[PDB]
Design a protein around this ligand. Structure first.
Ligand code: MG
Ligand code: ZN
Lengths: 146, 58, 319, 573, 322
């Protein structure tokens, strides 16, 4: 339960750094990502993980595939920040830090939203807790870097 | 075979209002969670919380 | 030769000589086990088994001979001519000045333990240094206790105490039995009390001579003697004893050592402390240049109280 | 026939560690210096002080007072003579000097013991009849005194010629020169000779009688220990504390120095030193000092001596607790505590150590000036300076001066010429022998084990049992005292807890960012909030540069371990 | 001979260690070398001695008759019996059998030694929250190896991502176990869990402290040594406690601290090494090792004890199997 925290922190630092790198001169994008990262756990708490992912989906389709998302191809800061947070959260649940690391995800590459629709209630609960935990780490680095 | 005590009484507790037996603030979506037995996840009220309440009333 | 293996159930206390009475001086710090403590544990078992003939009740020594002891995880204290330099412990060989053997200045000694294999290479003169990670320290475990009142369940006045235990995996003891039937009696016991605070160690016993006692070092003038257990007696008498037992005179010798080992103990027969004796500490090395070539023995017993496990020296060579 | 002669006296640290009260600690170190002085007297008598290369005697308070007969003040109370000496003597006198030095020290110790025996009986240290004095002077006890210290003396001719490359290679390091030509190498080789002679002499002690041991050192037979049982032996001694001959000398030694110099250390016990914290005792005495001594004598006249408490631990209420006159004192003490604060119960042990004959003399003079004058000036009356013999220091300090004194001494040493140090903060109740051994372990096994050394090792051993250790570079002390972080922390435990508990979960690549976060979370108008966060983060980053550690994580752990020590409200009330 | 004491916690346990290094104000006792939770032999012995002493004074000790300690004291100490009994009432000494088994009270320490050596209670099963089956009884190879060694002398390979677990912990078809918030993949294994249960049955019997041992088998999870150590150090209860200044109705000055607890549903074991009773002129029914062992088993088997502190706030209660 300690090594998993380090893995989360490593991922969180990486994705926030990518945000700050690509949009260094764009404070609006950085600020939007930060706000959404803070609001995200709340949306999950009050609506569940499934609905939250669906809510992100509406901010972007043919199929539910986080891989196919391209955050940089959007017009405004709101959609760019949403697409990034959505992909980050989905990537973590599906891939972790890669298959060369301790944590390689929970869903084995499957999109978390479709995963929720197919697997058991237990599978959904662990995905919910894990989602809250990674967002909690993203919030830390967001406040300190963005 | 429990000779350190001689008698025992069961204290039944029925909540008529919501109850927040606290464990303190956390860096989490739930800032102030209630007391829980960690390895079962069951809500509890620690004996020291209940003793403080009983003592103060008595 | 019989090999006894002690396996501590949990912790061990080999208390230093200092007052340790409830309600007064209340701090017990363990030292590295002295061989007489191990001898005492064995003698006490025989004392209770009814073999009071081999015990030596009220005597300094028993009838049998404790060859020596060693702790294990088998490890030995760093020879005192091994000096830490940066991240390496370097072996320092004897020099000569004014026709006298000396140890050249190369830094201060730092305490620690090495495996039996590292010691073997040292004794063969093939060891140059040891990486600091291969130098072991003995783990201590500090416990703080109290005494409660019978009824009120509160601490009695002044009844708090501290013990610094050792966390040791194994203690080995080797015994030469002149027919007392120690191997059979030890086999009948699973455990025994060893050291203080009524701690016990499991007992296993095997009829075998450890390989370190069977080494072939060859013949040379330049022999060294690593003391694996404390050695009691004047250096002059020990060197003279060495000359007699190997039938060879000595041109010069150098004792590389440290703080003398203070040895007293507790007399269970008379229920009072034993008299204080002083010994050459384990890890000390006696470098010897014999007048003629000698066959360096794998081990040799020197000094006083041999039967209690003292004076176990391991043979070696130097250049 | 010029001959380089080396003197070494052992043991030092074991003897010094055999202490129960602070007076034992001072007497041990001071007596050791006195033994070297008695030894050097033999050299000086024949060849004068200028033939003593090390240490520099012309500045030594012992030499000034006892040899030149000058009126030396309280600086005589500091042990300044080390346990090793180097001199140049005539070759024909070398063997005679060796014999005479050994004899002076035996006689001096025997004389001290005879006086100690007389003193002990007359002042009730031993509750025995005066007829039993002969029993105390029997041979078994005299052997212990006579044999305890080993004085090794070796020498080498400076005039003798030898092939330099042959003598240095054989030792383990025109081609034919006198030995004085390679004097620097000769000094080191002579140290080896001396170490050889140390082990030739120190393992020749006589076995002792069966019986109960001294309660101070635990290793030697206590006087009357062979003729009584434990309970009865204890009742025969003051404070139920049986003593061997060496520790009897130790207890007598302060009154001997008192009669010899008129001087006595200002701070008698570790409690006296502890209560220097924030001038607590001074503030109390002005406000409540008269009343307390009155109530103290009302309980017992034995509690008051010279209009003062016989023991400074009587400032603690717990001392009185562990009948109606006693309750009056405790209530009074507790009332004062609520007003001026609880009394400090922790103190600090500070130990420090360094990491052509004419040039060597200059070095010795510099070391003499540093140890005798500079270290004393730093410590002054802020605590008790027990020993300063060159590159090594032993002081007892209140916890609020420990870091400052240590840093100042280090800087002073730098101006004269690297020092490592151990500081152990410890409860006044903790056994002194253990505290001292822990303090030296901090110095020897922690600070000096750091690559490049020059390290301060700070240990805090709580009364409850916990033992926190932090390894820092000297510059950390400076940065911290000038830092906003310090003023903010002392204006807390939550900030420190979170960091220590979670630092192992931090990403290796993002440590700095996590530090930024915790500062944001724990440090807070919004104008001042932004400034304080930037400043404190910068200070933390500055402090981390001077923390000893393998990686950034261990540096963070080391730093916040340091912060946990100095913010401990129980240690710094 | 020796008696193995199994200890099963039914309420959280605080065996206090002052010397333990921790960020917690009041941490529990732990082993230096392994970092595992432990109950010191001296803590356990004190508990055992206090219970035994109370029973003896209350004439509830059975040796198969009622032990009358004052009667036995007189037929043992004879002329010195009355003063001894006086010391017992004065709480300077303990009753006869208590001192035979555990040694004299400190006042009479030098007279003789205690017959028993009470060993540390070592951890065996540590409860960890499981997504399936509520919680798992977690152990490790190093623990099993220690148990086997202790039992054999008195008479497994896993990666950090793997677990050998019973069926009730395993997610259907996924071959996974979820302990708290981490996922371990199930390593196929046939007899290791079964072997462990058999060992437990050989030491404590068919009933596992009030339940069939077969039920326990389905909820045992064996994890790697590093993972087990992690759980025993970071999954113990860390509870904030306060003191309320009722004058103000707010938390008093200096009235906040943190305390660690070993959870309920923890299994530990202590080997009680019994030597020969050492007191002179022993009564016949307790004059040797086997007789001391027998009294120990009957007195403590199926007993309830309180270990550690915080008794009055409901902590430290364990079931005992001997
Ligand atoms: Mg004891
Ligand atoms: Zn002494």
């Amino acid at each position: 339960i300690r090594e998993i925290e380090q893995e989360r922190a490593s991922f969180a630092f990486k994705v926030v750094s990518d945000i700050k790198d690509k949009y260094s001169q764009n404070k609006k994008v950085q600020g939007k990502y930060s706000s959404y990262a803070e609001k995200a756990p709340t949306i999950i708490l009050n609506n569940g993980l499934g609905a939250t992912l669906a809510f992100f989906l509406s901010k972007l389709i043919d199929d539910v595939d986080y891989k196919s998302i391209n955050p940089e191809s959007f017009g405004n800061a709101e959609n760019i920040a949403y697409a990034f947070l959505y992909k980050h959260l989905s990537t973590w649940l599906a891939e972790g830090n890669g298959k060369d690391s301790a944590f390689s995800g929970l869903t084995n590459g499957e999109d978390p939203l479709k995963y929720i629709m197919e697997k058991t209630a237990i599978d959904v609960a662990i995905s919910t807790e894990e989602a809250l935990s990674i967002l909690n780490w993203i919030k830390k680095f967001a406040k300190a870097m963005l | 075979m429990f000779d350190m005590f001689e008698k025992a009484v069961v204290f039944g507790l029925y909540s008529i209002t919501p109850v927040h037996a606290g464990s303190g603030a956390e860096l989490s979506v739930i800032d102030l969670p209630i007391q829980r037995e960690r390895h079962t996840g069951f809500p509890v009220i620690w004996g020291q919380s209940l003793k403080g309440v009983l003592r103060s009333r008595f | 030769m019989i090999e006894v293996t002690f396996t501590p159930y949990d912790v061990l206390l080999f208390r230093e000589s200092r007052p340790f009475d409830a309600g007064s001086e209340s701090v017990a710090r363990s030292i590295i086990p002295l061989p007489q403590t191990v001898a005492g544990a064995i003698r006490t078992l025989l004392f209770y088994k009814g073999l009071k003939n081999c015990v030596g009740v009220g005597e300094e020594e028993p009838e049998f001979t404790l060859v020596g002891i060693a702790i294990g995880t088998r490890i030995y204290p760093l020879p005192f001519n091994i000096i830490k330099s940066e991240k390496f412990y370097k072996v320092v060989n004897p020099g000569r000045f004014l026709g006298k053997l000396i140890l050249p200045p190369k830094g201060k000694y730092k305490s620690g333990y090495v495996t039996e294999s590292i010691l073997e290479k040292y004794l063969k003169g093939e060891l140059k240094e040891v990486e600091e990670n291969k130098v072991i320290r003995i783990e201590k475990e500090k416990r703080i206790g109290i005494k409660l009142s019978r009824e009120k369940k509160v601490v009695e006045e002044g009844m708090l105490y501290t013990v610094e235990f050792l966390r040791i995996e194994k203690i080995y003891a080797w015994i030469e039995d002149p027919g007392c039937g120690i191997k059979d009696i030890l086999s009948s016991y699973e455990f025994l009390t060893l050291g203080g605070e009524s701690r016990v160690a499991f007992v296993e016993v095997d009829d075998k001579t450890p390989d370190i006692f069977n080494r072939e070092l060859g013949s040379t003038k330049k022999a060294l003697f690593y003391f694996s257990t404390p050695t009691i007696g004047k250096v002059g008498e020990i060197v003279q004893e060495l000359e007699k037992r190997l039938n060879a005179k000595i041109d010069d010798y150098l004792l590389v050592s440290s703080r003398p080992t203070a040895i007293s103990g507790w007399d269970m027969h008379e229920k009072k402390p034993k008299g204080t004796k002083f010994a050459i500490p384990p890890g000390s090395v006696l470098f010897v240049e014999f007048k003629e070539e000698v066959e360096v023995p794998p081990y040799i017993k020197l000094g006083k109280l041999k039967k209690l496990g003292y004076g176990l020296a391991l043979g070696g060579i130097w250049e | 026939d010029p001959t380089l002669l080396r003197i070494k006296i052992v043991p030092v640290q074991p003897f010094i560690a055999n202490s129960r009260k602070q007076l034992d600690l001072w007497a041990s170190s001071h007596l050791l210096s006195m033994l070297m002085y008695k030894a050097l007297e033999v050299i000086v008598d024949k060849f004068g002080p200028e033939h003593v290369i090390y240490p520099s005697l012309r500045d030594q308070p012992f030499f000034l007072k006892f040899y030149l007969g000058e009126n030396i003040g309280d600086e005589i109370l500091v042990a300044n003579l080390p346990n090793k000496a180097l001199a140049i003597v005539s070759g024909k006198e070398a063997e005679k000097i060796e014999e005479e030095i050994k004899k002076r020290i035996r006689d001096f110790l025997l004389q001290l013991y005879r006086e100690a025996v007389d003193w002990a009986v007359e002042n009730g240290v031993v509750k025995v009849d005066r007829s039993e004095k002969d029993s105390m002077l029997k041979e078994a006890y005299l052997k212990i005194v006579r044999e305890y210290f080993t004085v090794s003396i070796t020498w080498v001719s400076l005039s003798e010629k030898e092939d330099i490359y042959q003598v240095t290679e054989n030792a383990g390091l025109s081609r034919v020169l006198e030995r004085i030509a390679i004097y620097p190498l000769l000094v080191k080789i002579l140290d080896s000779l001396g170490e050889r002679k140390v082990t030739e002499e120190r393992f020749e002690k006589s076995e002792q009688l069966k019986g109960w041991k001294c309660h101070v050192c635990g290793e030697n037979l206590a006087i009357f220990g062979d003729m009584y049982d434990h309970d009865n032996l204890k009742s025969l001694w003051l404070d139920e504390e049986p003593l061997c001959p060496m520790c009897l000398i130790k207890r007598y030694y302060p009154v001997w120095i008192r009669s010899k110099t008129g001087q006595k250390i200002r701070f008698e016990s570790v409690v006296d030193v502890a209560l220097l914290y924030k001038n607590w005792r001074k503030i109390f005495d002005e406000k409540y000092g008269k009343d307390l001594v009155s109530k103290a004598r009302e309980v017992s006249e034995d509690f008051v001596k010279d209009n003062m408490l016989v023991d400074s631990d009587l400032y603690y209420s717990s001392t009185w607790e562990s009948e109606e006159k006693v309750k009056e004192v405790v209530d009074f003490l507790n009332a004062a505590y609520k007003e001026i604060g609880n009394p400090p119960k922790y103190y600090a042990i500070l130990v420090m150590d360094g990491d052509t004959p004419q040039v060597h003399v200059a070095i010795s003079q510099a070391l003499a000036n540093f140890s005798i004058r500079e270290v004393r000036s730093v410590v002054k009356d802020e605590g008790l300076l027990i020993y300063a013999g060159g590159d090594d220091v032993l002081a007892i300090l209140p916890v609020d001066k420990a870091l400052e004194v240590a840093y100042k001494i280090r800087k002073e040493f730098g101006k004269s010429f690297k020092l490592s140090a151990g500081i152990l903060i410890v409860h006044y109740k903790h056994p002194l022998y253990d505290a001292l051994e822990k303090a030296r372990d901090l110095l020897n096994n922690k600070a000096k084990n750091v690559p490049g050394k020059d390290t301060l090792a700070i240990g805090l051993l709580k009364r409850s049992g916990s033992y926190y250790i932090s390894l820092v570079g000297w510059e950390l002390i400076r940065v911290f005292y000038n830092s906003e972080l310090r003023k903010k922390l002392l204006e807390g435990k939550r900030f420190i807890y979170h960091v220590l508990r979670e630092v192992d979960t931090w990403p290796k690549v993002g440590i700095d960012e996590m530090l930024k976060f915790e500062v944001i979370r724990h440090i807070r108008n919004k104008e001042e909030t932004k400034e304080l966060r930037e400043k404190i983060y910068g200070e933390i980053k500055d402090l981390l540069e001077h923390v000893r550690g393998n990686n950034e994580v261990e540096k963070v752990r080391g730093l916040f371990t340091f912060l946990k020590i100095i913010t401990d409200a129980e240690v710094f009330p | 001979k020796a008696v193995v004491f199994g200890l099963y916690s039914i309420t959280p346990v605080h065996a206090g260690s002052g010397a333990e290094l921790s960020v917690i104000d009041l941490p529990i006792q732990r082993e230096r070398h392994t970092g595992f939770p432990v109950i010191w032999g001296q803590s356990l012995k004190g508990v055992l001695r206090s219970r035994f002493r109370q029973l003896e004074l209350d004439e509830k000790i059975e040796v198969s008759q009622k032990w009358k300690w004052k009667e036995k004291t007189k037929e043992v100490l004879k002329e010195k019996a009355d003063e001894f009994i006086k010391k017992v009432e004065e709480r300077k000494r303990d009753p006869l059998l208590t001192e035979i088994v555990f040694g004299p009270a400190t006042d009479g320490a030098s007279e003789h030694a205690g017959a028993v050596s009470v060993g540390d209670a070592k951890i065996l099963l540590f409860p960890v929250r499981s997504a399936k089956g509520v919680f798992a009884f977690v152990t490790s190879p190093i623990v099993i190896q220690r148990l086997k060694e202790d039992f054999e002398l008195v008479s497994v390979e896993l990666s950090n991502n793997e677990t050998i677990a019973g069926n009730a912990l395993i997610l259907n078809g996924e071959n996974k176990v979820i302990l708290e918030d981490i996922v371990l993949k199930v390593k196929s294994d046939s007899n290791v869990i079964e072997n462990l249960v058999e060992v437990l049955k050989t030491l404590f019997g068919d009933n596992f402290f009030g339940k069939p041992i077969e039920s326990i088998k389905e909820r045992i999870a064996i994890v790697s040594d590093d993972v087990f150590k992690s759980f025993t150090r970071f999954s113990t209860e860390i509870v904030a406690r306060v003191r309320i200044d009722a004058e103000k109705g707010t938390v008093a000055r200096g009235g906040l601290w943190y305390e660690e607890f070993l959870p309920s549903d923890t299994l530990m074991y202590s080997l009680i090494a019994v030597g020969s009773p050492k007191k002179e002129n022993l009564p016949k029914e307790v004059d040797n090792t086997q007789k001391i062992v027998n009294v120990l088993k009957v007195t403590f088997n199926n007993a309830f004890l309180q270990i550690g502190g915080d008794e009055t706030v409901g902590k430290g209660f364990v079931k005992v199997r001997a």
